[PDB]
Curated annotation (Swiss-Prot), chain A:
Organism this protein belongs to: Severe acute respiratory syndrome coronavirus 2 (2019-nCoV)
Subunit architecture: Binds to host ACE2. RBD also interacts with the N-linked glycan on 'Asn-90' of ACE2. Cleavage of S generates a polybasic C-terminal sequence on S1 that binds to host Neuropilin-1 (NRP1) and Neuropilin-2 (NRP2) receptors. Interacts with host integrin alpha-5/beta-1 (ITGA5:ITGB1) and with ACE2 in complex with integrin alpha-5/beta-1 (ITGA5:ITGB1). May interact via cytoplasmic c-terminus with M protein. May interact (via N-terminus) with host bilirubin and biliverdin, thereby preventing antibody binding to the SARS-CoV-2 spike NTD via an allosteric mechanism.
Glycan-carrying positions: 49
Role this protein plays: Attaches the virion to the cell membrane by interacting with host receptor, initiating the infection. The major receptor is host ACE2. When S2/S2' has been cleaved, binding to the receptor triggers direct fusion at the cell membrane. When S2/S2' has not been cleaved, binding to the receptor results in internalization of the virus by endocytosis using host TFRC and GRM2 and leading to fusion of the virion membrane with the host endosomal membrane. Alternatively, may use NRP1/NRP2 and integrin as entry receptors.
Name of the protein: Spike protein S1
From Swiss-Prot, chain B:
Full-protein interval shown: 515 to 562 of 1273
Cited function: Attaches the virion to the cell membrane by interacting with host receptor, initiating the infection. The major receptor is host ACE2. When S2/S2' has been cleaved, binding to the receptor triggers direct fusion at the cell membrane. When S2/S2' has not been cleaved, binding to the receptor results in internalization of the virus by endocytosis using host TFRC and GRM2 and leading to fusion of the virion membrane with the host endosomal membrane. Alternatively, may use NRP1/NRP2 and integrin as entry receptors.
Protein source organism: Severe acute respiratory syndrome coronavirus 2 (2019-nCoV)
Assembly: Binds to host ACE2. RBD also interacts with the N-linked glycan on 'Asn-90' of ACE2. Cleavage of S generates a polybasic C-terminal sequence on S1 that binds to host Neuropilin-1 (NRP1) and Neuropilin-2 (NRP2) receptors. Interacts with host integrin alpha-5/beta-1 (ITGA5:ITGB1) and with ACE2 in complex with integrin alpha-5/beta-1 (ITGA5:ITGB1). May interact via cytoplasmic c-terminus with M protein. May interact (via N-terminus) with host bilirubin and biliverdin, thereby preventing antibody binding to the SARS-CoV-2 spike NTD via an allosteric mechanism.
Positions of region (Disordered): 5-27
Domain of life of the source: Viruses
The name this protein goes by in its record: Spike protein S1
Result after altering residue 33 to K: In strain: Omicron/BA.1
Length: 75, 48
């Protein structure tokens, strides 16, 4: 698959921005050694203090019971 | 209206003058003030 998508979430001083990209890659299992510069998408001014977050997936079976990377930051 | 610790979202400007070009005058570009000769540039900028 020649499709790599990367997203960046930040939450500072009441401003919310999202940095996104689509790019083609060709490697068997994980990220290649190539380099490129990400671009911002949209600025959101609500600025809610976010502590816990969840993602979404696509699936068919409605079994309701009541590959993504995540890293930390240093200033 | 409220003045709590939050970014300002709603306010409206008013039309004052018309566009000017190629003469060194002061300008207010998105809150940035400066004075210079405006000359068309051939450099390609990033969309953001």
């Amino acid at each position: 698959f020649k499709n790599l998508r990367e997203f960046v979430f930040k939450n500072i001083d009441g401003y919310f921005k999202i940095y996104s990209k689509h790019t083609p890659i060709n490697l068997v299992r994980d990220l290649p050694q190539g380099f490129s510069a990400l671009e911002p998408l949209v600025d959101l001014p609500i600025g809610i203090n976010i502590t816990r977050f969840q993602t979404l997936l696509a699936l068919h079976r409605s079994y309701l019971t009541p590959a993504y990377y995540v890293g930390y930051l240093q200033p | 209206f409220e003045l709590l610790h939050a970014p300002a979202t709603v306010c409206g400007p008013k039309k004052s003058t018309n566009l000017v070009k190629n003469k060194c005058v002061n300008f207010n570009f998105n809150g940035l003030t400066g004075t210079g000769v405006l000359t068309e540039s051939n450099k390609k900028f990033l969309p953001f």
